Amino acid sequence: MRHRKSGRQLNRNSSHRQAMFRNMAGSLVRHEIIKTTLPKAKELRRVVEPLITLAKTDSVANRRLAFARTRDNEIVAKLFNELGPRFASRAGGYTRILKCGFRAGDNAPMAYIELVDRSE
Template identity: 80%
Template sequence: MRHRHTGRQLNRNSSHRTAMFRNMTSSLVEHEIIKTTLVKAKELRSVTEPLITLAKNDSIANRRIAFNRTRNKATVGKLFTELGPRYADRPGGYIRILKCGQRAGDKAPMAYAELVDRPARSSDAFDDDVEMVEEE
């Protein structure tokens, strides 16, 4: 029976699925935007959002719980130093999923998973690059 089983199987065994979502969570926290399939992005939300909620309260116990779920010290550090304080006033909904067409090889629906309120890439850096090209 399938009672009270939540989440999608994604044609993977449980250890593969766990490792995949740990890696995707680490990538999302590090880069703040990743491109993946739509189904994986929707499942990623259920893994990553509780970690960000946990990071709002910085304590040794919470850091250990986060490390147990991600197995990445850099991810835990960024969660508790940057993302926890950034989303302290937000009650949830930290990840935005934007559809971006289909993959060329198999027409799988693709999506961007990004953190809400992430700092935009500075336009000053872009302007500096444009000026350097114009000078040459």
């Protein structure tokens, strides 16, 4: 009946949801922009944005807490060094979702999600 319930089940079990959101949070950190499904991009803001807020305070406890999540030392190194102080004045909202057409294989609504600097 779903009243005031949050979180998309996304046709997976809970171990798959925690695993794949652990994967596309690290790739959103690595490339700073990815293409994904639009329901999967709205649920990625509830994962990668607490990881950026965890990077505001460089501490050994926070770097291990952000290693218990994302399980990748290259992600813990791009946070706290290149994303913590870079977003240190932004009071939340570090991502942006832009809808991009429909996928050719299954007619899935797609979205780009990127960190809001991307200054090249």
